[PDB]
Amino acid sequence: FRKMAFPSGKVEGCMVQVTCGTTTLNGLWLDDVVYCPRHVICTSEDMLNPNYEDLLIRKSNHNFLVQAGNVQLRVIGHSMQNCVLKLKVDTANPKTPKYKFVRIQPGQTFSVLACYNGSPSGVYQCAMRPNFTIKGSFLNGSCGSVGFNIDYDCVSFCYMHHMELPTGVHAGTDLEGNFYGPFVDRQTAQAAGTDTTITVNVLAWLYAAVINGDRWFLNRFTTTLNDFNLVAMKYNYEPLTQDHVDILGPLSAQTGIAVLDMCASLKELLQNGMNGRTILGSALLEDEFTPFDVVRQCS
Amino acid sequence: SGFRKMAFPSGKVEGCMVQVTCGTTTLNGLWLDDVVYCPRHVICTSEDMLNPNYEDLLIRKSNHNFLVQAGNVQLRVIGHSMQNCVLKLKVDTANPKTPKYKFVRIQPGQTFSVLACYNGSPSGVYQCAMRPNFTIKGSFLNGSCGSVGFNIDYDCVSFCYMHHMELPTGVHAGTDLEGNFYGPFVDRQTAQAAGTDTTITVNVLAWLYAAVINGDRWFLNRFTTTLNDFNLVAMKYNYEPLTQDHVDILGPLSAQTGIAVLDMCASLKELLQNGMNGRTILGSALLEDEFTPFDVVRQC
């Protein structure tokens, strides 16, 4: 049971390189529009208190260098949609797949195609943390990297990398320029909130362990929704709602274990530890597997 | 901090995956040029797997008995031959999506990306390492036979693994692209026991060197140990013994830093006897052994 990422083939053909002056980052080429973070028009000295609306007036179409491999894309128009620049190019991308722009909620998972200078280099699976950050691997030049989910024939773009916080975490926006979290696209001291463990994802992971035959944390006891949240709040676990119980329905029928019955096992794990044992070969509880991910990978 | 286990982009490999059907069995195949590669047990039923006579089974088959399907376009099989444990199906049309490719055989401890496919359709990609017992610990359901492992260097794809069998212990076994099995495993439905799995010591040391470069230093100690003494302690924790070749590979890591290889071994020895004590190294609460030294000194 590994953390698999979606195939990146449909996304690799849409990555381009956007250059404005000295700054170079990655862009998303869909149809005849190139999407990239709006701070590409700002120098290192302009990131203190940038005025994007005034800076964009200065720039023209010939100040943007869009490169797709060996070919050069010619910019004929520019626009801004919140914290995202929309560059209109003269040629449509023939590699454009069936796509859709969606905004996800914290706790959901998606695959990230890390790119450098418009060239994909790696792909990995991650989840949106409750503090609206992601524990990704972004170095310098990886701005503009996109996160996506893959339907049967449709690619849902949900994230674009914008900034790197001074803690190893990264922050970004959706494809419409709306930031995930209280962050702003400026070079200043920005603090991420207290990260909490995704309780619903842990329960789904525990169901996956039961499917794989690893059944030792199961106990005869059961708890209430209110009692579990009291323990969950103490151990920095997000509160469990009724909709979370409904989502875990398909996994409850396959294993025969009720959600509240499983919560008693998780409650004992937090208080008494792992008792020197492993679940699915791990000494810690994974919280980056959504209930939908468990169904996809198992049933 | 932060060191993600990243997998190579799979775009160049997605266009080479096909579906091969022989009778009732259906698995995945690799379409390169005018040759389709797939495990040879596709011509075996569930009853023949106990004692398969592949020479007897293959001679009774014809070209029209193999159904090769790349999406909706059906390929025409014009010939076939068997190389060790792999089947080579020659088709009438070459694959226009064929990239610059190579066939390499890897040693235990090396890492590669795996593209999991079901009935010729890719489903997911993950990064793994060849364990010292010549097995891989991934997610392979029924119908994933034929999925390949690869590495990408610049623009060249290096195919190194093809999934063949799933062991009763939950691990998977396979061959290289020439049909030679990794380990003593065979393509039979018999009781095959994998060896004891051990931690890749050289990968852990390379990972620890990346930690001191990135900031973490709490595990360093003032002691040093000999290579012979370290192995006597390492074997007690099911750690692979360290050879002189591993020391030379870690040379550049000890050059950028100030810590000798034997110095780092003493620190690793102290970590094993004490544990993490609630602390983390590069954001990880466990010692990682799936990062090769080559990857460590490229992305420092």
UniProtKB/Swiss-Prot annotation, chain B:
It comes from the Viruses. Coiled coil: none annotated. Changing Q189A: Does not affect ability to cleave and inactivate human TRMT1. Residues 1-300 form the Peptidase C30 domain. There is a cross-link at K5, K90 (Glycyl lysine isopeptide (Lys-Gly) (interchain with G-Cter in ubiquitin)). The active site is at H41 (for 3cl-pro activity), C145 (for 3cl-pro activity). Changing N142A: Does not affect ability to cleave and inactivate human TRMT1. It is found in: Host cytoplasm; Host Golgi apparatus; Host nucleus. Residues 1-300 are cytoplasmic. Changing K90R: In strain: Beta/B.1.351. Inhibited by pyridone-containing alpha-ketoamides compounds 13a and 13b. In turn, alpha-ketoamide 13b (tert-butyl (1-((S)-1-(((S)-4-(benzylamino)-3,4-dioxo-1-((S)-2-oxopyrrolidin-3-yl)butan-2-yl)amino)-3-cyclopropyl-1-oxopropan-2-yl)-2-oxo-1,2-dihydropyridin-3-yl)carbamate) inhibits SARS-CoV-2 replication in human lung cells. Inhibited ex vivo by michael acceptor inhibitor N3. Inhibited ex vivo by compound 11a and 11b. It catalyses: TSAVLQ-|-SGFRK-NH2 and SGVTFQ-|-GKFKK the two peptides corresponding to the two self-cleavage sites of the SARS 3C-like proteinase are the two most reactive peptide substrates. The enzyme exhibits a strong preference for substrates containing Gln at P1 position and Leu at P2 position. 3CL-PRO exists as monomer and homodimer. Only the homodimer shows catalytic activity. Interacts with host FBXO22; this interaction promotes the proteasomal degradation of nsp5. Cleaves the C-terminus of replicase polyprotein at 11 sites. Recognizes substrates containing the core sequence [ILMVF]-Q-|-[SGACN]. Cleaves and inactivates human TRMT1, preventing tRNA guanine(26)-dimethylation of tRNAs. May cleave human NLRP1 in lung epithelial cells, thereby activating the NLRP1 inflammasome pathway. May cleave human GSDMD, triggering alternative GSDME-mediated epithelial cell death upon activation of the NLRP1 inflammasome, which may enhance the release interleukins 1B, 6, 16 and 18. Also able to bind an ADP-ribose-1''-phosphate (ADRP). This is 3C-like proteinase nsp5. It comes from Severe acute respiratory syndrome coronavirus 2 (2019-nCoV). The lineage of its organism: Viruses, Riboviria, Orthornavirae, Pisuviricota, Pisoniviricetes.
